[PDB]
Every structure is written in C-alpha cells, then in structure tokens.
Symmetry: D2
C-alpha cells in the first residue's frame, strides 16, 4: 500500500479550498543534514512537504497560488537536470518531467527561486508560510517580500498578511484517509513482525544492539528501509530509561528487555513496545508488574472510541495502576486518596497516548491535558508503562524493572482497530513463543 499522485493532488486542492482568494502557500523541502565532515545522513523529506508531494529531493519548494475563488495553480521549484551532478550523486526529476510525474502545473529551477518567487507573490493579499520552520526558507521568503515592499517604482506590492499554514495542515494530517490507514496498517504489520523476530532471537549473552540489528533487518526486508525513530532496547535497569538508545549492554539471564521500535513505511510510522524476559520466563516479580501494565493496555483498547478522550482513558489506567501497586505494597494507602495525589507518577511518568502518522509523535491539537474528543480517522498509540528505579523505596524484588507495552490504533466509527496485535503481549503467549524458539 502507498500514497499515489492523485492523493497528493487532492491534498493540495483541499489546502487551496481553505486558502483566501489572492494568496499563495509556500511549502519547503528539508535541508540535507551533515553526519560528519563531507558525509550526510540519509535524506528525510520534511513531513509536510512530503504530505503534499511524495517528492524525496532536497532544494525544492511547492507554491500553491489561489488567484481568486475559481482559479488556482501550482508551481514546483526543484533541482535542474545536470548530467555531471547526476552521474555523481543520483538522478534528478528536473523541470520537464515534474508536471506529469507529480501532477503540478509548472516546474522551475530551484537556482532561479530568488529571481522568480517575488514575481509569483507580487500583488497577492496573503502568503501562507511556516515562519521559523527552516532558516534557509525564511531567508528566501523574507528576501522576496523585501523586494516587493521596496519595489513600488517597479509596480510591485507585497502581501501584507502572512499566515502560518501549520495549524490547518496539521489538522488535515490528524485525520487519515483510508489510503493512509492502509499504509499505517502495513507499517504496523511490518513493525509487529520485527518485534516477534526480536522475541524469537533473544538469548542471554546477546547484546541489546543485536536485537536492534534483527529489527532493522526485518523492517528492511519488507521495504521499510529506515526506522521511524531511534530504536530502544533497554534490558534490566536500562528499561527504566524511557528513550534508552545506547543499546550497549550484554543482556542478562533473569532481566527483562524493553524494546520500543517502529518502521517508517512510505513516510508513515509504526511504533511498538514489547517487554519480555531475556531468558524466556517471567519471574514472579516481573509478572506482577507486567500484569498491571497489560491490564492498563487491554482496558484502554476496550475503551478507545469516538467520543472519549486520551484524558478520560488515562484516568482509568491511573486507577488500574494505583490499585495494582497498592496490592503489591509499592504504594501504601487508600486508592482514591493516592489517585488524588497522583501517587502513580514516580512509576508512570509519561503520557498514555500520542498521535501517529508521518511523524511518530505526530502533529495535531490534543486539547488541554489531551482532553480533545476522539473522532474516526485519528491514529494514536496506547503505551502504559511502569518503571521501578533500582533505588526505589519499594519491596526489593521490584527494583530495576521497567515495562512498557504499546500498540498503535485507529479510531473507527464504533471503537478502534488495533494495527499491531499481530505481535503477542499476553505473558503466557510471550513465554510460549520464546520457549518454541529456544527449542530450535
């Protein structure tokens, strides 16, 4: 599954529909990024630029011009064909091929942007620009507007109104099309296969980074070349560090390992966490904490639906956690009083859910305390966890246990669809999976 030319075009048109007559929207590509000296990191297109183009080159700018309420057109600035540059560094789309390939009306060389952009903005009332997104982009836009402001003797005029299109565009991204959901479903499947593989491969004495290697190989074979974020493989005490990415330790017989990893497939993020015993068998202490996190996730998956909110579901999870921690003697006191005191926070210190899409921590307004009412088309994670620090003042057997279990869901008309349930999470299923692998 992918996003096609006609969908990118529909998105451009939907933005144009929201724009004032006599305006232009400017969407800039990501800069290339140095890794060291003259070597660059693998290119990652800006999510918003990608959303409207599916075009994976730097030095590109999409300009949507809404001349009035019926007439609009698009102009792409992009790198020129250049035989020597292409022999060295790769093929370029160029100007001749872009209109047909991308479904834009006109294409111009990026090298000419300063000579041309002001001409496109001249006489417009409004420019939509994400000020501060990129320095290079602000320079180009500010230069164009200055030429227009200072150009009255050449009959030039600048648009006086600049509107940040990020809020409008991020609200578009928050609600996924069926095609987007299909892509996210595939990302979830790929990511789940990777996690299953990690559980089947994990043995005491392997290094945390070995599981990262297994996961990334699995992503790759299904055509998700890159992870959507830096893979976390936190064994033992390392699991208590939320974004542990050192992945440098030897995994010990008797420790849990917490894996938070997700692929990037056609631009879209998977995002799964599974925690499991390195040796294939939960200890009693590990199981006692695990059961509370799993109940939290299972209850959340029952509850998430249109008309509730992340805040409302979080309240249910907090009750589950406080209740469970009191039963184990990790917290002491009356459950309702402890809830009132947010007594869970030393052990569950992050949010239950974030939006998911072209960014793993995806764009879109959450509302105060993530109270926004959920609607069909929203995609989000569900990621309860409990982290008991090595020096926590709790019964000894729980110290140094970090557990998180995370699925990706889409809100539907009656509830939700779990995109990542194809990798096991019930403790008996984890143990059976690992037992079977360990016998081979």
């Amino acid at each position: 599954s992918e996003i096609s030319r006609q969908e990118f075009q529909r998105r451009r048109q939907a933005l144009v529909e929201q724009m004032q007559p006599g305006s232009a929207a400017l969407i800039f590509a990501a800069p290339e990024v140095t890794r060291s000296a003259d070597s660059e990191y693998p290119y990652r297109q800006n999510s918003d630029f990608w959303y409207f183009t599916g075009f994976n080159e730097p030095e590109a700018v999409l300009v949507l011009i809404k001349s009035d309420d019926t007439h609009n057109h698009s102009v792409l600035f992009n790198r020129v064909r250049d035989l020597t540059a292409e022999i060295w560094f790769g093929r370029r789309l160029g100007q001749d091929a872009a209109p047909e390939k991308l479904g834009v009306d006109r294409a111009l060389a990026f090298s000419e942007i300063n000579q041309q952009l002001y001409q496109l903005l001249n006489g417009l009332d409004v420019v939509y620009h994400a000020q501060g997104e990129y320095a290079y982009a602000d320079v180009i836009v500010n230069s164009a507007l200055e030429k227009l402001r200072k150009g009255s003797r050449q009959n030039l005029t600048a648009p006086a109104t600049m509107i940040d299109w990020r809020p409008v565009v991020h609200e578009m991204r928050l609600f996924k099309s069926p095609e987007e959901i299909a892509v996210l479903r595939r990302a979830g499947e790929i990511t789940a296969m990777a996690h299953t593989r990690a559980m089947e491969k994990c043995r005491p004495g392997m290094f945390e980074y070995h599981l990262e290697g297994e996961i990334h190989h699995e992503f790759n074979r299904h055509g998700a070349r890159y992870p959507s974020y830096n893979t976390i493989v936190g064994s033992g005490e390392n699991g208590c560090i939320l974004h542990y990415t050192e992945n440098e330790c030897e995994m010990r017989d008797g420790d849990l390992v917490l894996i938070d990893a997700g692929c990037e497939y056609k631009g879209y993020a998977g995002d799964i966490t599974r925690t499991f015993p390195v040796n294939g068998k939960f200890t009693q202490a590990q199981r006692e904490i695990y059961d509370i996190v799993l109940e939290s996730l299972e209850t959340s998956l029952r509850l998430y639906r249109p008309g509730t909110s992340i805040l409302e579901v979080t309240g249910e999870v907090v009750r589950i956690m406080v209740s469970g921690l009191v039963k184990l003697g990790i917290l002491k006191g009356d459950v309702d009083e402890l809830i009132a005191q947010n007594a869970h926070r030393p052990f569950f210190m992050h949010g239950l859910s974030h939006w998911l899409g072209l960014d793993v921590a995806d764009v879109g307004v959450y509302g105060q305390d993530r109270s926004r009412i959920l609607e069909p088309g929203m995609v989000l994670t569900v990621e309860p966890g409990l982290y008991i620090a090595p020096d926590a003042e709790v019964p000894e057997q729980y110290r140094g246990i970090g557990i998180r279990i995370e699925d990706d869901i889409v809100i539907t008309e009656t509830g939700n669809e779990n995109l990542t349930a194809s990798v096991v999470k019930k403790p008996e299923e984890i143990e059976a999976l690992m037992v079977a692998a360990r016998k081979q």
Copy 2:
C-alpha cells in the same frame, strides 16, 4: 580492538606539545541533528572531538590550557547530572566522574560555559579554535573574546591571535598509531564479512535495498552499529552512478550489482566496493570490463609503498585502462596519445584513492594533484572503476556496465597491508563463491 583513555590522553598531550606557551585550544562536540520534527538522527560525535576524548555526548567542549612551557591542564565542559533528563533520555557522565573516566583535570557544567570560558582565556596570548566548524561554537567563542576585549576595567585581556588547529590535528590524524591500525583492521574485516554475505545472498528478483539490509545486519552483529557512509547498491545502469543510494530497483538476471559499503567501528571507517553478477555468472562483456578494473587494483596493490604517491600510481592505472579500452574498441587510437588527451575520463572520472580514518573521506593534505609522498602510517583506499553509460558511443554490449573494486590499505615500512582482501575479487573466485551459495 579499541582506542583507550590513555591514548586519548597522549593525543591531547601531543597537541599541547605543538601549542604556543600561554594558549588554549577549544574543541567542540557535534550538535544533535533533527531528522523530522521532534525526532533526531542517531548522534554522531565530531571526529576531531572524538579523536581527543572518546566521549559520545553533545553539549561538551574540551579546553586544553598551556599556561607556559611546563604547565598545562585540561577542562571539560559537559552536561550536568540531572535525574529527570536522564530518566527520559539517557545517562550522563556529569562533572564528578569525568576527570577519572576521561583523564581530564577538571570538569564544569556546559550550562556555565559563558560564565567560565572567558575566565580561562583571560590573559592568554593565543586561542586555537576551528572558526566556522559550528555556528554554536563560534557564538560561544566570539562572546568570550568580546567580554575580554571590552573588559579592560575589570582587568581582562583577550588573546589577539586565533589559530585554526585543524591543519595540525588533521596532520596528526593522517598518521595512524598501531592501535588505530588495529581498529581499522577490524573495521576492514567486518566490512569484508558484510560484502561476502551480500554476494552469498544476492539472487535475481531481490531489491537493491535487500543487500543493504544484509550488509547492515552483518555490521551490527560484530558491534559496528552504523555504516560509515550511506550504502550504495547500484545494479545495472544504476552502477554507473557513483553515489547511487536510492537502492530501489529489482535486481535483474544478467545485470551486475556494484556495492560500496563500509562500517563504522569505534569511530573508524571501513570502505569496500565489490561488483558482481546478480545471477552469479559474469557475461563475456562484463568480464572484459571487470578484468581491466581488477588489473588496475592488483597493480596498485603491488605498487603502493612509502616513497610513491597517489598521483604516480594513478598514472599506471590510467595506462592499464586506456590500453584495455583500446583492445575492446571502446577507445580508438594510439595509447600514448590517448593517455596525453586523458581519454579515459569519460569512463573513469574519479580519483583512485582517498585517505581513510575517523571519516571515510579522511582528513589530511594530499598535495597538488595528490602528489604527496606516501609514508608509513597513512591509510587509504584503492578504488579504480569503469562506468560505461547506457548511451555511450561504444560497442553495444558494454553499455550500462558500472564496475568499481575497492580495498583499504595501510602503508607500511616495505609496502602496504591490505585490510580488506578477505572478501574475494578475482572473477573466478566471485563465481565459485556465488555458485556454492546458490546450490544451498
């Protein structure tokens, strides 16, 4: 094999030995780099900063103070211990532990750099600073010097002389210690195992990116988490693109695939290229071009030694290439006249060799036209290639063939050591390797 605390210390001392009395050298860490929105690329420390510290954190600055010809000391600025930041994002070395861990005299919080740096520079004659390396670093240094310049009423004075330490440090990096060579030897071995794996796994119908996946998994299992540069897997016509990294095509029965990939092991780069038939058997045309590139590499490996140069060895390769291309009818005319006209350049348009080390295209002065005389301790690649474009005016059977074969070598007292000869390159050996794999 690795580089240890005492070696990092020896390097700092060797720099101090080269510094003027009454001076300070400032070496800054790399910034963290955005991949998309709030996600960052995996951190890569600045090579020069790494060379003197082995410290893999951002927000760090090494200050070497040479008070006079006998007295010197070191100060590290680095991130403070912070329980909440560490729970979220990972452990920090902090100030208490740094002197012992890194072998520096003092450690101070990076948050205090603007309050402290000017005090360390006050009254010195010379500051060594790599101006323009990083914007954030220039801001810090320029601010410190301004405070000193403007501080005469507070009895402050700025060093009037600023010296770029890059030339001195890059000349240090150009000559590897035995420990560095051991690390590079291991990088070469790891990288060679990865290339052997790619040849053994390659089958028609696999995608170029699948071989990338095999290679990166192999790097990872030996503890080289990341490649030293973006992997190139160019099959068919894609092999004619020097830094082809799209790796997006289905590999065809009858095409060659050119793989240029290298690991990063303890900071140091491997860098191997092998080209081989996708179906395990070179065609006659493919073999005819391959033989010329291989002879070029083999002759270069015989020749490279102290007292010759990249330029001198390149002349021998050019003769081999022109001679071979005339024999096949790709070039026409007298060999010596064609050499005089650089007639090989449409087909071999890049350099034979680059330095290798903490950067894949490593630092160090080459001399005019890479004429610098070679000495023991230099490490370099040997990477002849021939690329016959799909539209070249040559006998048809050669069109769309791109072949490069690259090894990594170290110059020794009598010649060179090949660090990457453990992956085959003779065509009969490539075919035997692939035949054996294809029968499994």
Copy 3:
C-alpha cells in the same frame, strides 16, 4: 505648535479601530546608532513609533491589545528607573510615570519583554508586526511566537496570522491632522528663515559649508535642533549633483549655489531648495535656465489641488521645460516629438514631488507613476530642476549650471497652501534681497 498626548492617544485608537478583534499590534523604538567606537549619533526615534507615542527613548515597545470589538488596552515596555544609569546618561521616564505621561494603560520594564510579551500574545488570532523593520525587534517577536507554538503543554497558543501594519499606518500618516499641518507650517517657516539667512550671508570666497553653518544655527534658534536630512550646498558644477553633501568648496564669484536644506521640528520635516548667485547677480545664461525652473514651479503651484495628480502636473512641467530648452537651443526639434521622446530627462532626471511628514521622503502610496489622485490633507514638495553638466553637448554658456527651486505645500479643499513662500524665489526678489544684504 506641537503634537500632544491626546493626539497620540487618538492615533492609537484609530489603529485599534482598524485591527481585528483578538489581536495585538507591536511598534518598536529605533535602536541607538554608533557614530564611532563608543560614541553614538544623536538619537532619532523611529517615525512610526513616534507617531503613536511622542516618546524619545530607545529600548521601548508599544503593544496595543484588542481583546474583542469593545475591549482594548495598551502596554508600554520601556527602560526602568535606574539611579546610576540616569546620573551617567540622562533621565528615564520609567514605569510609574509612563501611564499618565503617555496615556497608556500599563508600563513594564523592557528588561522583562521576553518574559512578558508571549503572555500578551497568548491566545490571540492576529499579531500586527512590521517584519524586517529591525533585526532586534524580529528576534523578540520570533522568540515570543516560538515559545507559544512550542507551549501547548502549558496551554499556550500562537496567533497564526501576522499582518504588516505599515500599509495601514502609512496611509494614516499620508493624511495630516490640522495639528500636524500647524507643525509642518512652523517647520516651513523655520526652514524659510534659514534659507533667507543663507542668501543674506552668502559672499564669494565663503565655503559651501559656511552656508550649512548659517542654516543649522537658524534651525536651532527656533527650536529645531537637527536637520531633517543632510544639507546640500552645491555651488558651480556641484549644483549638478542632486544630493551633493561634501559642501567642501570655496564658492566662486560668478557661480550659482543650490541649497537644499530642511529642519526637523517636533519630528516633522521642512524641505526647501533655493538656487541663487554667489555674487548676488544672475548672469544672462543663469537667468535663462532659472526662468524655466521658476515657471515650472509657479505653474505647479497654480495647478496642485484635489483631483489632479503628481503625474498630471509633471506633464505640464515637462512641456514647460522642453519648450524653454528648445528656445535656448539646448534641445533641438519639434516640442511635441521631444516630449514623446522624454528629451528633457538628461536635464531633469528626478521626480517633481514627494510626500512630506515625519520623514522628508514621507511614507504613503503614490500609485503607478505617481498617478494617485490628490486629496485634502496630503503634504508634498514641488521641486523642478534643470542640471546642465559641464560636458553637456549644449551651447557653452549653459554648461555647469544646476538649478532647483522647491516649496512644500498642503492640499486643501480648493487647491493648496504654500508653506514655504516666505523665502523669495523670483530672480528680481533674490537679487534685491542680496543687494540689500551686501550693502551692510
């Protein structure tokens, strides 16, 4: 005559009336400007900031908040009272006194602007800001908006719409109140007295700069401390240079001197040009050119009125000039054909008129080719000139003559009022004035 607190307040209210509900307008003071090393030029407040405050301090920002269609208020950021800074550098208004003195609702310390500005913008829909006017201002505004954009977890929101208030404010400035016209009338009177003085003082052998000295002294004694622009005193060939400010030459018996000088009185510019003989008597050649420039000015003064334009009146002047130059043999051919060819342009190469106000070349839209229809309340100059270069291919006697004659006018309901007719311009009146002075 001056502009008073209540008028500054009316202007602020008139801007607020034009603003969208749920918005804030930000108007920043001018930076102080270095002359050399640690010495600064005399402070000149930003015209727009002045227009809304009458406040002559740097490090000040006026914030007009329109909460909704009935509720609005003003906040001034300005320098705090500071006993030591004031002993050294001058008194400051401070926060306690500002509301009463300036008629603003609240005053806050400029040192707190970054801690406070984002709080004032939070939750607004629109911010009015003159982007690019000052770097320091853009930094402050961009920082505030970034804090808001990134502050969703603190329940902060940024206004998505930024509107340049310059067009609205400059249209306000283009139409003068009666009080403004009174101030401009006084500026015109002061400037005219200065020009009369220069004619009465001028003698052969004096330097051009001596007349500058006379003029500036005259400005000063009437309470116009500073000129509104750099005084031009161009004698002989120097008169052919439009903005000649070197003023370095000895004025020669037989040359004309062209003086373009104007005071700045309560922020408002006078702008007069008079040209006259250094020795008090026009030569025939000088008079022949002078008569054409004077007829051009006199006809323009008859014509300027509501309903015509600078472009229309310029056409009449061009005819006068071409006709006169043909009569003298400076141009050759048919007058209407020469007009069609813009044959006057080598000799009259600038505009007839510019707006006049808080800037000498005042703000406001002219329309294409200065075609905007004139209306009561506009204030403008009328400045025909003819400049015959020393090497012009014209009858010899005219070479090196530069003449400009300029008055300041206000458009009224039936025509115009000349603000600067109290300094003579008829050649017989100039000669009588100078003869009388030369006899003393």
Copy 4:
C-alpha cells in the same frame, strides 16, 4: 593643519614593519548608517580605516600584503566610477585615480571583493583582521577563508593564523606624531573659541540648546563641520547628569550651566568642559564648589608629565576634593580616613582623564586602574568635577550644583602642553568675560 598622503603612507608602512612575513592586513570602512527610513546620518569613517587612508567613502577595504621581509604592497577596494550614481549621490574616487591620490599600489572595485579577496589571501600564513568590528566585514573575510579552506583541489590554502591588529594599531594611535599634535592643537583652539562664544552669548531665559547652536556654528566656521560627540549643556540640576544631552530647559538666572563640547577637526577630537553662571556671577555656594574643582584641574596641569600616571595624579585630586568638601561640611571626618573610604565618590564618580585622538574617548591601553606610566606623545583630557545631587544630605546651599572643568593636554619631554587654555577658567576671568559681553 592636516594629515597628508605621505603620513598615511608612513603609517601603512609602520604597520607592515610589525607584520609577519607572508601575511595580509585587512582594514574595512564604516558602513553608512540609517537615521530614519531612507535618510542616513552624515557619514563618519571608521577611525582605524581613516588613520591609514584619509579616505572618506564607504564600501572600501584596505589590504596590506607583506609577501616576505622585503616585498610588500597595498590594494584598495573601493566603489567604481558610475555616472548615474555620482550625479545622484556624489563623486567617487574610483580605481584609476586611487593609486596616485591615496598612495596605494593597486585599486579594485568593491563589487569584486568576493571574487578577489581570497586570491590575495591564498597561500599566506597570517591574516590580520579585527574580528567582530563589523558584521559585513566578518562575512567577507569568513567567506574568503572558507573558499580557501575548501579549495585544496584548486590548489588554494587559507592562512591558519588570524591576528587582531587592533592592539598594535591602537598602540600606534596612542602616540601622536608632530602633525597629529598640530591638528589636535587646532581642534583645541577651535573648541576653545566655541566655549568662549557660549559664555559671551549666554543669558537667563535662553534655552540650553541655544548654546549648543552657538558652539556648533563656531565649530563650522573654522572648518570643523561636526562635533566629536553629542554636546552637553546642563544647567541647574541638569549639570549633575554627566552626559546630559537633552539640552531642553530654559536656563535660569541663578543657576550654573555646564558645557561639555568638542569639535571634530580633520578626524581629531577637541573635548572641553566649562561651567559658568548663567547670569554672569557665581554665588558664594557655587564659587566654593568651583574653587575645589579648579584647584583639582590646576594641580593636575602642574603634575602631568612623563613618568607619572593618571592613577598617581588622581590621588592628588582626591585629596584636594576630600579636603575641600570637609572644609565646607559636605563630608565629615578625618581627611585621611575619608580618602581611605573613597568618601569623594558620591560627588566625583568618574575618571580624571581619558586618551584623546581620532576618537574622543581614544584608543590605547591604560593599565590597571589607569596606572600606565605617561610618555611624550600621549594626549589626554583632565576633567575633575563635583556633582551635588538635589537630594544630597549636605548643607542646603550646595544641592543641585554640577561643575566640571576640562582641558586637553599633550605630554611633552618636560611636562605637558595645554591645548585648551585659550578659554578662561579662573572664576574672576569668567565673570569679567561675561560682564563685558553683558554690557554690549
């Protein structure tokens, strides 16, 4: 008196003598400075640039190249001849005329600086540059060095050492040539005539700014067009503000007026302060304070000589002040104890002396607490003062009195020459001067 071409040349040569072989020094002109909108302040050349050129244009850069110990040459970048730009804005020196006019070897267009500067720096070991002096200059220099650093394949190399030439050049400026002293002597004479005029013109009811007008007119008539700093005319309580420049009050019968004003003559500053009664007669209270400041100045003028210091002479002044203030009951206690407590500081809170030259607060190292030993050729001010605030806890009659008396001196082989003694300062001489003027 002036500074001539051959002296500017001698200075360039003296700098070259101090430079390392294989180096270039870069000295940049001042930017033009906006006053308001499209009007600029009168141009003031950068003092250091002026010191080496006597060239009063912007967009100019002096490059001194010391190829080795015997061979050196100079290159000026400056604005090209341009007929239209010159007709509009003034004559330009251009490239053809510059070598002869300024005594430089070569001149190139400023528009070509980025194409040419790197070529001049290529292969040098050292560049002398005043980093941070001007943003535009840093941009040009940093760009040149980057091209060289990145240009190894074009056989380019950057100088690795950058030296701030300000310390060397400012030490040159600290010691005046006889020609410089002649110019400063004339500045002192002009400035003294201006102060005498102010005393002769001052009457109760005039505004502070009227005396500014008299002073500036006097500067102008002697060919010092501009003041060297913003004129201070502080009457009554305003005299207690050290750099009072509002000059806005009506001068009252019974108040003193303190005038601190100085001309700029051929680039060099005069700097005189005189305080005198507005009505021509000191009151007893005024005279009592005045006598202490005058004794302080007179004693300083006796003492200043080679081999003493500003710090040493300041100690003598402090004793005079404390002794006098005890006698009047303004201070109470033992003189030596009060001196030990710096009890004078509420009333004399600034330094006695600053260097004087191309800047009024001139360049040059003072040493700790201005302890540097004086030598012939140094030029400095002597400016004791006493300021008794309106709310000081002192006998009532002294409240609101601010007195400063300042002369400019040059250190000579036996003592000093007073450059400004031609304007009276003894109270009986001030009164006689004013009485005589008031009778006219």
